[PDB]
Structure formats: C-alpha cells, structure tokens
Assembly symmetry: C6
Homo-oligomer: 96 residues x 6
C-alpha cells in the first residue's frame, strides 16, 4: 500500500487534517509521531489514488486552521520503513 503523510505545527491542525484524509478516501490512519518543537505527523496507507486524495484533502484542512509543515505520498515505501517508523498496517510500532 502507498503511504501519505502530513506534518503540521500544532496538534489540532493535524487531528483535523487526519479526519479529512480518512473521510475523503479509502485510506487508513496508521500512526502519528511528534518530534518536539511542536512538529507532528500523521501517516495513512491505502491505494496510490487514495493517498493522493487523502493527503490533498488533509492539506486543505490543515491550512485552514493551522500551519502545514509538509504533505507527501510515497507510492511504494520500502518494507524497511515499517521496521523503523509508525507506518505499518498492524500496530507494530512507535511505542518504546
């Protein structure tokens, strides 16, 4: 499955962006990660088309209420990514 991601500065932009992604396409919200500085990121998985609709829906909403840091789709993420980041079809992670 492809991967879509949205970064926001502020958590309410990011929760709203996520609700938008998920309502706008068959994508699944799989995890969310903050890195300090107030930066936070949501990840979704689904079909490549969906992740483009998703992240495009989610970017819209973020910008209406927050501050988008970045939006991006990786169509075919390396399986190696699922080991290290909270982007994985089964609660595999991002809790340490």
């Amino acid at each position: 499955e492809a991967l879509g991601m949205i970064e926001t500065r502020g958590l309410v932009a990011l929760i709203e962006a996520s609700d938008a992604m998920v309502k706008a396409a068959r994508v699944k919200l799989v995890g969310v990660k903050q890195i300090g500085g107030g930066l936070c990121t949501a990840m979704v998985r689904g079909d490549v088309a969906a992740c483009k609709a998703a992240t495009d829906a989610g970017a819209a909403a973020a910008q209406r209420i927050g501050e988008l840091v970045s939006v991006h789709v990786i169509p075919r993420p390396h399986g190696d990514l699922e080991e290290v980041f909270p982007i994985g079809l089964k609660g595999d992670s991002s809790n340490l």
Copy 2:
C-alpha cells in the same frame, strides 16, 4: 459524539480553558496532549452544540490568561481518530 479541542502555549491557560469548557456545556474532557515547544492541547466530547459552547467558553478563558494556539470543533470525527489520538470516550489511550 462531536470533538472540541483547544491548543494553548502554556499549561495554565490550558487548564483554565478546560475548566471553562467543562463548566459551560455538557462536554467531557477526555485527554490532553503536549507536543514540545510548550504546545498543549485539550480534547472534549459531547453533543455538537455543547462542543461549540465548550470551546467557545474555553477560548475566551485561554485568551484572558495565556496564548491560544487554536480552537476547533469537528462535529463527527472518524472512528479512526480514536485509535491514534487521546480523543475517546474510554481511557483508551495516549500513554505509550
């Protein structure tokens, strides 16, 4: 149930904003999350009307004593949001 959220820069604005939300409407404070940078966020659930009264009460108070980062109501949050964020009618989360 709808979802209301308030972000503040500083925790005493946010505790006061929360006491305000909860006193002003039938909404329930369900969790609170910081993301570094001194940003912190409270979430409430209740009827759509309540979450508008709540967050409108809470914004007032925040601004009197702190620095509101953002206020917002999502009337019908996707169930997918409850998996990933501390917005959930049963201590399901935001402890890892």
Copy 3:
C-alpha cells in the same frame, strides 16, 4: 479545594516559587508538569484564600529569580480536571 498554579520558564524559579507558596499559606503542592520549551508548572490545592496567598507569594519569588509565565487561581475546579492533570489531592497522576 481551590487550585493555584504558577508557570515559570526555568526550573529553579519554579522550585523557589513553590517553596514560597507552601510556606505562605495552608496549601498543598500536588504536582508539577513540564511541557518542553523549558516551560514548567506547579499546582497547589487549599482554601480559596490560601491559594490566593500562596500564588501571590510564589509569583513574587519567581519574578525575583526567573521568568514567570503565568499565575492563576481557579476557586472550584471541575472534578474532570483531576482525571487529566496533576492537580489532585491523592497521587493519582501525571505519570504515564
């Protein structure tokens, strides 16, 4: 019991502010929370009068040695606050 709170930027202001609060009135220091950015907050509980004496004693001291972010008393905090914040007469929290 009422609730008093002091925010400081820097932890030595905040420890001194707390020693001040607690020496100046019958209030009890119940917890302390940092939110990154170097922001940290102390909470006390006691009679409404005490929490005004407390926080007024604590603000004085903070400002002599640090940087007060904010001071504030909520006379009758909603019981809902004790679920989510380290403001509670019994080590109920703020450890996750």
Copy 4:
C-alpha cells in the same frame, strides 16, 4: 559495515530520504533518532560504496521536500558506537 546518516528538520523529509537511501543501494535502515527541536536522524549500514549512494540518494530527496540538517558516511565506525547509538546490525537499541 559502513554507516550513513541523514538528519532532517521535519519527519516527512526524513521518511522520504530513508525510502530513497534504501531503494538506491544495498544498505539497511537500522534506526532513527529524534533529539527535540524537531531534529531527526536516520542511520543505514552497508558497503562503503552503498552508503555513499544511499546517502547521496537520500539527501537529494530530503532537499526536495524538507530541510536537510546534514549527510555523512563514516566508512568504519568504531564498535563502541553500537553500544551508545541506534546504529547496529541487530535491534540492539535505542529504546530506554
């Protein structure tokens, strides 16, 4: 094995940089570490040639979408590094 590393300010640059590294050379993504301030770092291991191809692929991508903080290859990292940093051929670490 050599060690390659990419730092980004923002996590979506860094996830994209990583997918790039790993697709562009026989290197293995071994861990990722944030240090607050929104700084985050990915580490890869492989042959010296690979880690140069990797990190050069990963830098490209980071800069297209984010803000690279730094890129660098250490051809022959001291074994002492594997004790203290998440750069190690076997989930040995960076969880405390």
Copy 5:
C-alpha cells in the same frame, strides 16, 4: 538540609558546575532535571554555608564554559518539595 541549585543551558556546563559544587563544599548532589529547550538543573543538599560555597563554586565554573541560567540557595526547603522535585536525601525520585 539546605538546597542549592544551578541551571545551565547545555549539559557540559552543568556537569562541570556540579563537579565544582561537590568539590568545594560538603554538599551532596542529589539529582538533575531537564525541562526541554536545552535547560538542565542540578540540585545539591548540605549545610547552608556549604550550599553557598557549592553554588558559588558551581556558578563560576558554569560561566567559564557554558551559559548559566540561574543560581540559588533555599536555606530550609519545605518538606513538600521532596515529594514533587528531585531534591531529596534518598533516591526518592524524579523517575516516572
């Protein structure tokens, strides 16, 4: 016992300041706490005279190599402080 405290921006100032405090007087290093933003604080306990010698030794050293945020002695800290902060003659705390 009295309480002395030093705040530094940067951890090597703070480790050096601590070695200084402890070599210069009969005070005991009891804990150290960071609050993000790169702020970190060391606490010592001993006789009031010692904590003045200590913190005065420690301030000197900090300023030679770092950035002192603040220095301060509280001669007779409320017992309530030992519940909430890492200032306590017996590893009672500051691990949650």
Copy 6:
C-alpha cells in the same frame, strides 16, 4: 579515570565526533544524553592525556560537519557525578 565531553547541536556531528574521540585515544565511550532543543552530548573516560586527545580529535570532526556546543575535560570527576550523569565505567545509567 578522567572524563571528556562534547556537545553538539545535531546528532550526526555528535556521532562523528564520538567515532573520532574513540579512534584517536584510549578512551571509552560511556554514554550520550540529549536535553531537547536538539542539544546532545557524548561522554568518554580514560587517562587524562587520552581524554585531551580524544576530545580534541572529536571537536575537530564535529566542527567540520555540525555545530559544536562545547568541549571539556574534567581530569578527576567527583564520584558523585556517576550517580546522577551517564558518565560511568559500567552501564549504571541514564535510563529512567
């Protein structure tokens, strides 16, 4: 044993500085600590001569690729330091 320390703003400077320290002298990397703000610090132990060679090797490298915050050797660190900081000849710490 003496103690050497390097602070960097950015983790790849710091990993490179460490590989340098350890290759340049008989010193041992004993731990590493971040304090938010993107500040991170490595500690080494060895003979006083070594820790001067080490930290001097490590500073060089840091500055070529990052931003050194500070370098410093304490020849004879108080045993009290090993209780509170990740500077200790036996995985005693800095995990809470």
